[PDB]
Write a protein that binds this ligand. Sequence first.
Ligand SMILES: Nc1nc2c(ncn2[C@H]2C[C@H](O)[C@@H](COP(=O)(O)NP(=O)(O)OP(=O)(O)O)O2)c(=O)[nH]1
Ligand SMILES: [Mg+2]
Ligand SMILES: [Mg+2]
Ligand SMILES: [Mn+2]
Ligand SMILES: [Mn+2]
Length: 540
Amino acid sequence: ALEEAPWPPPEGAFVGFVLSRKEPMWADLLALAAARGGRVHRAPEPYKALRDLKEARGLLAKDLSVLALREGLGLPPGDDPMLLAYLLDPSNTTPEGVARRYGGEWTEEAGERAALSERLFANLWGRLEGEERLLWLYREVERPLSAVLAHMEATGVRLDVAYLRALSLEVAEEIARLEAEVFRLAGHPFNLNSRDQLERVLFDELGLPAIGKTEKTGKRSTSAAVLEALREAHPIVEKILQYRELTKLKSTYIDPLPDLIHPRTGRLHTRFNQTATATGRLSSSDPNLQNIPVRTPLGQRIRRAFIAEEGWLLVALDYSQIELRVLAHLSGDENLIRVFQEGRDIHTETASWMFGVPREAVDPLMRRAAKTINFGVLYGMSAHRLSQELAIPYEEAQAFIERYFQSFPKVRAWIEKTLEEGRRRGYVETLFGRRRYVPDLEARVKSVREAAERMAFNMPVQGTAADLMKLAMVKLFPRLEEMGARMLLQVHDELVLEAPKERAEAVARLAKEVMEGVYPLAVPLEVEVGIGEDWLSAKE
DNA sequence: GACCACGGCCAC
DNA sequence: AAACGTGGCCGTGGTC
Ligand SMILES: Nc1nc2c(ncn2[C@H]2C[C@H](O)[C@@H](COP(=O)(O)NP(=O)(O)OP(=O)(O)O)O2)c(=O)[nH]1
Ligand SMILES: [Mg+2]
Ligand SMILES: [Mg+2]
Ligand SMILES: [Mn+2]
Ligand SMILES: [Mn+2]
């Protein structure tokens, strides 16, 4: 089809490339090609050939930009059909699916990938004609954001390896104590990591009551929520829960992360996936640095391992009560607007009530648990579940849900308005017009339809918060480059920056103002900021 | 070795 | 587990 032409391609050509593995910071570049003008250009040696491109345009452009940055090359990502497709329909998450849907096949050959990129861009650009709000999201948020994310991925974050190595040995001994006690109490050994074997021990051998079932297979559940209901029914349960806490943290964070330090940077590199969620959030993988522990004492020790370069400090910025502020703007509830114009904190107020203590007496943990309650109730938690979570009667949980919504009466009205337009249109949208298609709003099975409803009216709130965070990153990044600071991590409504010590205070003030003023709403956005040598100390 | 489904659980 | 939502990683179990 396309005519074979010699490398290098003309400027503006679409790129195709093949990696030895999905992670750009770790991949060998196996092949590189470009397409334009009815021609395909295949690079004889892909690494040297990278130097000839001025921009990465095509499928997965950010990934190639990250690998280019790793090699010390300034190759910014530009147009990417994945971003066009993701804005049309966020279920467009993979190149295999986007190709099949919009006019090609995702193969394992760079030249074909280049040609595909060119063809898909033409077609998806056609599909977005007249979709001015989606085009605004593309031009003003997603396309420039991909350059920011590429820099973040290639920079990475420093980890106190030696500290985590020592911690692993300590936690191993504590796990053995717990495992040995569980085996003694069971009367025999078994694989405590096997929920099938544990199910048999707890409910058949020890005759404990089984209060819940698993979704797909209908086994008697051994989840923490079920075990919590049995803490006093048998001493083994407590040991199991402690075993699970420690093995989760050791197997997921303590042991794996030190092995992922990159040999050239000496740092840890995540991937920020831009077309991965139904709501417009980013995701993080390989490793996921958006679920680093924070709750328990051991979790906090793990978070302390994330440190600044010597002579630098971390700056952590996190939006206050962000989805409740977004809800206030979307719904227009005067009571909820007044809450934020008055400086009130709904998480602290729920915590004080939950634990029966003055606001002053609430600590960050109790507040973070009240946060779960406030959003749980908002997005549809049942009184049955709430009464279990809070250890109160069904009747008192029922009453809490009623007063919650009676306090902000326009919220329920906004919920039902959102679902009505989602039924008529087939999608719901954020403040900026990002869409999520929810066909099951018309489902004839109530449980399916009602699950769809909770997904559907969550998306405008969570997605607007994501749009705002993304726009803030796009605005903030060039200001940080000017000041010699780095953007390292995003955790949905939070940024972790790295700044020279002498500039950390100025960077913190600037980043806070950029984030708070990203897009004025009917309520102020407030950002909490901290500075410290480690991630835990920077969020205090 | 790989793949996947599942339960389970960490964070936002 | 349960009528909160959004993700990704773990080990197990089954399979190729
Ligand atoms: N549905 C749901 N959404 C959640 C949950 N946890 C977080 N989110 C969503 C809604 C949250 O607004 C958003 C960011 O989460 P945080 O920064 O941890 N909490 P926030 O910003 O509310 O309070 P502050 O920062 O003052 O402590 O993620 C949850 O349990 N459920
Ligand atoms: Mg210890
Ligand atoms: Mg799953
Ligand atoms: Mn927040
Ligand atoms: Mn946060």
